Write a protein that binds this ligand. Structure first.
Ligand SMILES: Nc1ncnc2c1ncn2[C@@H]1O[C@H](COP(=O)(O)OP(=O)(O)OP(=O)(O)O)[C@@H](O)[C@H]1O
Ligand SMILES: [Mg+2]
Lengths: 234, 238, 48, 73, 240, 232, 96, 48, 240
């Protein structure tokens, strides 16, 4: 009843990777939308006690001056991945002197996913595959770019992604409100509508978080002052 | 069934089950076709996507000016191998200053992937590489498998529901000895059209074509200039 | 087993309609029986 | 070719392919294909059996487990 | 039970089971024959045609390890290729260390010891191929050797491996091979191959032949196309 | 290659090391032996008996001299006794190369027991199967020691290890005392080896070694034949 | 000998369904929890033609089980069970 | 097949004879058997 | 009698035994051969049998005897590959001894070192304890001839007359009864006794093409293999 971490199933799929895929369903939801105007990211927090400090827990964290990341699932381990992303970007800038596309960073990270190996090397990021699901949002020369990365090592560019426990409902409902002539404000409004609809508890200006990136300025996130404008204007 | 937990063990009938399982995993990918003419080699791939608003997964990769590959399986191992291919070709060019012949490279791949299927607690690589290249002896089509075994072929098709396409290739086998690129690629697409159900077919967003030839370097066409190839194709009889 | 050898060497002649045996059929039979006994146990056993 | 002898099979099957698509099937399974593929057609109320029904039957009697998402290729 | 799992545990009756499983793995390969003549040896391989798409000359089962030694294999192709590579490396290493072509009686031993190293520890598995080595030297005569997965190296006047080993070696022994030179041996080999693998089991196949001896200045190589054409034409008459 | 890197002897639910106990049970089935000392020297006696007349008893020995003044005998498994003897020789040389002085017996015993115990906590091995008796004569006072697969060591005045060893202990208690002679020691040791000896006692089936404040020696068959005579 | 008698029982059951003029107009129907231990000769078709499989409910399964097992309740008229379905990832009908 | 024993006989098929139900505990197979027992008309012998 | 993993690895049984070594000894008998060795007054002789089931096999390459050193010979029993490995180990060890100390190795020390090497295998939990037994004959100065035997468990010893194989027990009985005569020994007597012992145990009355003999004498310590002619001479002279 005990097998190594490197076993193939009688139908061809791996065991550990399938289990991690099933495990990322225990995290909070997260929704990302890309528009020619810019990219927007929204996340929940799942506050449990009034002694929570809501500003202490964060999901969106920048990778550089123009790349943002959204995380779901477990959190404790993702710090390593974020760190390697930042170090790689700065190393590339040091060696070559330019800015990298979000695609190159995405695959440069994804090559790190499948490394668990019981035998062989010295201490490795072994034991298990990482349990986090990531959205990458950036603005490069070809406009805004949104990518989705998965524990199996597969990355793909999407237009409207929803990941987390309530992913299915968000994805199902999101198809009927998107098209290519989209604008930033109404995009953010529709995203907020979806989040509030699938929320568990009540909605306020501290239970959610948003961030936006446009070709003009850098990565910028809203605080508790400009966030309620769209809430009252729902 | 305790004979089914590690590479090292041998079944009573003398068939290790891990390798059979890896082959079965390779049969999970999307279809792909490859074939050769007298002086050109063409490989065709059909793509896949999850939701209507997500981009299609890419299949064909660029190895070197005279060598291209197609992939079916899980992608991480695919990248792990492509890096090796690039490294070796660059090394040969740097030292001996000449293109690396395809067969020597394929032998290197076989020797490399054989090692893990023998030690303890090491899995095999799950990929279904199709190699298309041009050398001093002309075109070349090769296929590998997770069992560290490779074959030389003149027309091969792999992936889920690749059997009907293989039968079609077998039927029209001779005429490849006189056709040119214009009709060669049309034959390849005709072959690929059989492995689809009776509701949807080619729409220029699910097709990718790679060509190498005696006087043409390995080129990839996808989603735009593909319409010139596709147009003029007879409809599926019903 | 040797009775069996002497039987098979005749069986190989009942077909091909030879009413006489010749030395090649003994070779055939001996090798044919030689490989069929690879599934007995070959433990001797002893009273004690 | 033996067992499907009675039902009104259309003149379009290609047993030389089906035999190559089956692997490790023993004889009884190769029988069972010929009945499953006879039931599939009646499910859709058609008359003659057709090739695709045989392919469906094959995909049945392997009895492979649920595979959820397919993220390969 | 559970005594047949690893290759480190003896059965109560006193034998290792994994090696026996490997040998049973060998007994499903196609077939190969090799016989010695007055002044050389001749190999012969029959390759089944799995499907029409493959080419002739694919997946060669005859490997020329050195400039003067030939190898024929039966089992799993990948393991055969790896063993061929290690043998070739051993030959080159020996030439560099000392400075002349290695004799058979040493090369076969080195390969045998290296193979036998894969049947003690539990961290590896035994190989799955059985092979034959042949060569000729002007000052050494004609040498033939056969090696199995267990690690046993033996010398033969002529032997055969594969499915129908017994059937083939029935007719191997009838020929008077002590004297007659191996220019007419080739016809005998074609005849002895065409009398096995009935058409009921499979429809069509192809044939490979090799060559070594002072007839070709001791080098080892492949036979010319016309010679095998004549041999096949001749063996077409033996079916009567 | 690579070993296993996890020990095979672990605490049982009642807190008892199973492997070391099984090793002791195996030790109890070896060839019997006895050891005595009295105020002038030390005597070790052990029994050997070849199965058939074909064996050349002149080729192997039980009593092995480590140095000119230290003696060792064993009870239990056959082969690994040689390994332990070799290690003891090596330790003796290593010590002598520092202080230019023969090793005192206590230090030798401590080091050997250290090795024997260390061997039960390493990776992928099983302990030895021997019980050792060590004799020496340094600084006038004679010394006797007995080790154990567990690594514990004791100092005994006279003891017996092997088959039916409890009866040997009782008999020695009923006979041994504090003031004797070397010759009487030899006679009583031979007598207690004859408690359950074989069918007949000869001069080649008994191995006896002595060590006095003059040195350690192994007795030749002539004196063994004489001592077996005028006895029993 | 171990389980020999039970093995003879199993063999008789097997034999009753195959070989020499079978039963004809009789249909069987079986169930189990850990089917990996079933014997190959019993799972061969001609005896167990279909291998229906029951898996853990997905999402319409969970909301629908709630609808069925709670439709005889005196509860509030404005609660949503979809959230309840989301809150329990892999669970059986028993838990509902 | 029991309540419409003409379609299969007319067209020329014989329906299967067995079925196995498996899954983790608590999933609900025994309940399916009860449903079948409630619906039917011919006899029905239960054995454990 | 056992619980846990006593039947799979070399660990102690509850009763004090260990089975993975006791299995190698019965693994010895799988080949089905027997050898006998005798020590004379100033000579040493070894006799073995060889079996060649088919004509295709080259009869000149199945010798079980090997030449370790110009003064020391060995004879093999048991499996094949393990035998070759142990032989190579012995040759290498003797050559290293010669390099290191500058004079020839006595037979006893060599046997001790090979047995000690075997002993480690029964101490760890990764290897198999090499099921093949060893017999050595040599001459030592100031000691005459000497005959030693080494077993898989690591128990080496010097004998006066020994037999290894399927029929060990009855052969030892016969040798004991014969050696009880307590008489002088010469070369002819030694060879005649060694031949007739095996002859009566197997009850064959053989031909000179089935038995191999090795000897060493104190006039020319070079170990040598007897030619078939003088073997026939001994054999016919024995039958009065
Ligand atoms: N689809 C379903 N619809 C309604 N209730 C269900 C469903 N699946 C399971 N249940 C409930 O869960 C329980 C299922 O247990 P049941 O007695 O049927 O056993 P089982 O799952 O068939 O097998 P086992 O006896 O091995 O546990 C029942 O109480 C039933 O009410
Ligand atoms: Mg139940």
């Amino acid at each position: 009843y005990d097998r190594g971490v490197n076993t193939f199933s009688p139908e061809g799929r791996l065991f550990q990777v399938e289990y991690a895929i099933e495990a990322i369903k225990l995290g909070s939801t997260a929704i990302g939308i890309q528009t020619s105007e810019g990219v927007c990211l929204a996340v929940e927090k799942r506050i449990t006690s009034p002694l929570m400090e809501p500003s202490s827990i964060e999901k969106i964290v920048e990778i550089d001056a123009h790349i943002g990341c959204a995380m779901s699932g477990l959190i404790a381990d993702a710090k390593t991945l974020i760190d390697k992303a930042r170090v790689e970007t700065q190393n590339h800038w040091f060696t070559y002197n330019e800015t990298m596309t979000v695609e190159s960073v995405t695959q440069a990270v994804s090559n790190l996913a499948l490394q668990f190996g019981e035998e062989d090397a010295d201490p490795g990021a072994m034991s298990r595959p990482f349990g986090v699901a990531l959205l990458f949002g950036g603005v490069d020369e070809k406009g805004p770019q949104l990518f989705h990365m998965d524990p199996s090592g597969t990355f793909v560019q999407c237009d409207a992604r929803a990941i987390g426990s309530a992913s299915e409902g968000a994805q199902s409902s999101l198809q009927e409100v998107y098209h290519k002539s989209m604008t930033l404000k109404e995009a953010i409004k529709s995203s907020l509508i979806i989040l509030k609809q699938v929320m568990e508890e009540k909605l306020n200006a501290t239970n959610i978080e948003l961030a936006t990136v446009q070709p003009g300025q850098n990565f910028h996130m809203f605080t508790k002052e400009e966030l309620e404008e769209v809430i009252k204007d729902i | 069934n305790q004979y089914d937990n590690d590479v090292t063990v041998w079944s009573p009938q003398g068939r290790i089950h891990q390798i059979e399982y890896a082959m079965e995993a390779v049969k999970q990918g999307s279809a792909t076709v490859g074939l050769k003419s007298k002086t050109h080699a063409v490989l065709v791939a059909l793509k896949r996507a999850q939701s209507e608003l997500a981009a299609h997964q890419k299949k064909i990769l660029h190895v070197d000016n005279h060598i291209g590959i197609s992939i079916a399986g899980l992608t991480a191992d695919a990248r792990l191998l492509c890096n090796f291919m690039r490294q070796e070709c660059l090394d040969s060019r740097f030292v001996f200053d000449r293109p690396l012949p395809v067969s020597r490279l394929v032998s290197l791949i076989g020797s490399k992937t054989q090692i893990p299927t023998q030690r303890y607690g090491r899995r095999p690589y799950g990929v279904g590489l199709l190699i298309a290249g041009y050398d001093d002896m002309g075109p070349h089509i090769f296929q590998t498998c997770p069992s560290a075994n490779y074959f030389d072929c003149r027309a091969m098709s792999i992936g889920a529901r690749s059997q009907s396409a293989r039968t079609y290739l077998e039927r029209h086998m001779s005429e490849f000895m006189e056709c040119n690129l214009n009709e060669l690629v049309k034959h390849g697409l005709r072959a690929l059209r059989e492995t689809l159900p009776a509701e949807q077919d080619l729409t220029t967003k699910n097709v990718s074509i790679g060509i190498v030839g005696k006087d043409l370097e390995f080129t990839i066409y996808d989603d735009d200039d593909v319409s010139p190839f596709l147009e003029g194709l007879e409809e599926r009889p019903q | 087993d040797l009775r069996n050898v002497c039987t098979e060497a005749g069986m190989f002649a009942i077909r091909a309609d030879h009413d006489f045996v010749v030395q090649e059929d003994f070779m055939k039979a001996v090798r044919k029986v030689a490989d069929s006994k690879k599934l007995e146990s070959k433990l001797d056993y002893k009273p004690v | 070719q033996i067992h499907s002898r009675k039902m009104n099979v259309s003149p379009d099957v290609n047993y030389e392919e089906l035999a190559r698509c089956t692997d490790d099937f023993n004889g009884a399974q190769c029988k069972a294909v010929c009945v499953e593929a006879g039931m599939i057609a009646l499910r859709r109320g058609a008359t003659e059996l057709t090739h695709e029904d045989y392919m469906e039957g094959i995909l049945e009697v392997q009895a492979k487990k649920k595979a959820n998402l397919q993220y390969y290729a | 039970t559970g005594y047949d799992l690893s290759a480190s545990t003896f059965s109560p009756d006193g034998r290792v089971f994994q090696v026996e499983y490997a040998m049973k793995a060998v007994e499903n390969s196609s077939t190969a024959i090799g016989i010695r003549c007055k002044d050389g040896v001749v190999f012969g391989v029959e390759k089944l045609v799995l499907s029409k798409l493959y080419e002739e000359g694919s997946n060669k089962r005859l490997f020329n390890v050195d400039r003067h030694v030939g190898m024929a294999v039966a089992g799993l192709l990948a393991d055969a290729r790896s063993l061929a590579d290690i043998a070739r490396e051993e030959a080159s290493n020996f030439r560099s260390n000392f400075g002349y072509n290695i004799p058979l009686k040493h090369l076969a031993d080195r390969v045998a010891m290296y193979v036998h190293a894969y049947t003690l520890y539990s961290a590896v598995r035994p190989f799955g191929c059985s092979f034959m080595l042949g060569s000729y030297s002007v000052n050494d005569g004609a040498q033939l050797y056969m090696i199995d997965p267990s690690g046993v190296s033996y010398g033969y006047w002529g032997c055969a491996i594969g499915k129908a080993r017994q059937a083939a070696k029935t007719e191997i022994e009838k020929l008077q091979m002590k004297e007659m030179t191996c220019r007419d041996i080739v016809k005998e080999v074609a005849k002895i191959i065409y009398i096995v693998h009935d058409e009921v089991k499979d429809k069509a196949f192809e044939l490979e032949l090799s060559w070594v001896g002072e007839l070709t200045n001791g080098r080892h190589e492949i036979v010319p196309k016309d010679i095998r054409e004549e041999a096949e034409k001749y063996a077409k008459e033996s079916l009567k | 290659e690579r070993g296993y890197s996890f020990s095979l002897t672990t605490f049982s639910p009642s807190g008892k090391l199973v492997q070391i106990e099984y090793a002791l049970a195996a030790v109890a089935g070896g060839a019997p032996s006895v050891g005595i000392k009295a105020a002038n020297g030390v005597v070790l006696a052990t029994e050997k008996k070849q199965k058939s007349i074909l064996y050349d008893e002149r080729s192997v020995h039980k009593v092995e001299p480590i140095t000119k003044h230290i003696g060792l005998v064993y009870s239990g498994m056959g082969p690994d006794y040689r390994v332990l003897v070799h290690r003891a020789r090596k330790l003796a040389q290593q010590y002598y190369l520092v202080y230019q002085e023969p090793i005192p017996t206590a230090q030798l015993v401590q080091r050997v027991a250290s090795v024997m115990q260390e061997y039960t906590q390493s990776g992928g091995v099983r302990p030895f199967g021997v019980s050792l008796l060590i004799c020496g004569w340094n600084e006038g006072r004679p010394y006797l020691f007995q080790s154990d697969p567990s690594g514990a060591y004791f100092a005994w005045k006279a003891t017996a290890m092997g088959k039916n060893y409890v009866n040997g202990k009782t008999f020695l208690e009923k006979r041994y005392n504090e003031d004797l002679e070397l010759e009487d020691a030899i006679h009583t040791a031979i007598l207690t080896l004859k408690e359950s000896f074989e069918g007949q006692m000869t001069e080649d089936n008994i191995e006896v070694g002595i060590c006095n404040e003059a040195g350690f020696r192994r007795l030749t068959p002539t004196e063994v034949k004489d001592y077996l005579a005028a006895i029993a | 000998g171990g389980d020999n008698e039970v093995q003879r029982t199993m063999l008789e059951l097997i034999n009753q369904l195959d070989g020499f003029d079978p039963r004809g107009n009789i249909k069987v129907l079986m169930a189990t929890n850990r089917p990996d231990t079933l014997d190959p000769a019993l799972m061969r078709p001609g005896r167990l033609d279909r291998k229906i499989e029951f898996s853990l409910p997905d999402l319409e399964g969970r909301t629908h089980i709630f609808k069925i097992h709670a439709r005889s309740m005196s509860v509030e008229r404005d609660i949503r069970f979809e959230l309840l379905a989301r809150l329990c990832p892999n669970s059986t009908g028993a838990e509902i | 097949p029991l309540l419409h024993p003409e379609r299969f006989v007319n067209l020329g098929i014989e329906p299967p004879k067995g079925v196995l139900l498996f899954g983790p505990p608590g999933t609900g197979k025994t309940l399916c058997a009860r449903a079948v027992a409630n619906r039917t008309d011919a006899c029905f012998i239960r054995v454990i | 009698s056992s619980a846990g993993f006593d039947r799979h690895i070399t660990i102690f049984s509850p009763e004090g035994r260990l089975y993975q070594v006791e299995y190698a000894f019965k693994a010895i008998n799988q080949g089905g051969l027997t050898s006998v060795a005798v020590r004379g007054k100033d000579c040493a002789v070894i006799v073995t049998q060889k079996k060649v089931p088919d004509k295709l096999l080259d009869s000149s390459t199945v010798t079980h005897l090997f030449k370790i050193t110009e003064n020391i010979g060995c004879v093999m029993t048991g499996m094949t590959a393990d035998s070759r490995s142990q032989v190579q180990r012995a040759r290498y060890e003797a050559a290293n001894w010669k390099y290191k100390y500058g004079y020839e190795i006595p037979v006893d020390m060599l046997c001790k070192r090979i047995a000690d090497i075997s002993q480690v295998y029964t101490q760890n939990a990764e290897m198999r304890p090499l099921g093949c037994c060893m017999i050595l004959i040599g001459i030592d100065e100031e000691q005459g001839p000497q005959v030693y035997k080494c077993d898989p468990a690591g128990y080496y010893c010097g004998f006066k007359a020994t037999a290894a194989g399927v029929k060990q027990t009855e052969s030892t009985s016969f040798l004991e009864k014969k050696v009880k005569k307590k008489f002088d020994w010469t070369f002819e007597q030694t060879v005649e006794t060694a031949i007739t012992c095996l002859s009566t145990v197997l009850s064959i009355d053989f031909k000179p093409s089935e038995i191999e003999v090795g000897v060493v004498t104190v006039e020319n310590p070079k170990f040598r293999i007897l030619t078939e002619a003088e073997i026939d001479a001994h054999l016919v002279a024995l039958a009065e």
